[PDB]
Design a protein around this ligand. Structure first.
Ligand code: CL
Length: 139
């Protein structure tokens, strides 16, 4: 009863404590968001030459099942002319967000093999029924 079509509203705010990924420069970071293993895959812009990138980008991702869905956040380094250079990732269970609540917090990204630190990323997440205003508490 009372079937709802939930959406994941996610603001990829900023990150800090990113690793130096090459001999020169600092980090040219962007985040990749993926729901489950689906083709709902989104990318932020690249912020060049900083360990403290600020994206402040919002994405609106339709959900399949709020009791089991997972958001994976991959942090990677741009490598022009070559493939993305992976930094770190985290898998976030959608079922841990109180429905309708706006949760702003920092997440500890797990560095991949060979990477000296993973960084921390700030996300504002709101799991909201369709029709509710994004990023405002839903009553
Ligand atoms: Cl798909």
């Amino acid at each position: 009863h009372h079937h709802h079509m939930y959406q994941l509203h996610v603001r990829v705010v900023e990150a800090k404590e990113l690793p130096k990924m090459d001999t020169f420069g600092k980090c040219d970071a962007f985040a990749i968001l993926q729901l489950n293993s689906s083709r709902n895959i989104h990318r932020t812009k690249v912020i060049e030459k900083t360990y403290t990138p600020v994206w402040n980008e919002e994405f609106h991702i339709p959900l399949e099942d709020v009791t089991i869905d997972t958001l994976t956040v991959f942090l990677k380094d741009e490598d022009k002319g070559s493939s993305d250079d992976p930094i770190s990732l985290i898998k976030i269970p959608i079922n841990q967000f109180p429905l309708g609540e706006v949760v702003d917090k920092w997440y500890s990204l797990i560095p991949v093999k060979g990477v000296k630190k993973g960084g921390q990323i700030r996300l504002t997440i709101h799991i909201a029924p369709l029709g509710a205003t994004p990023f405002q508490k839903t009553d």
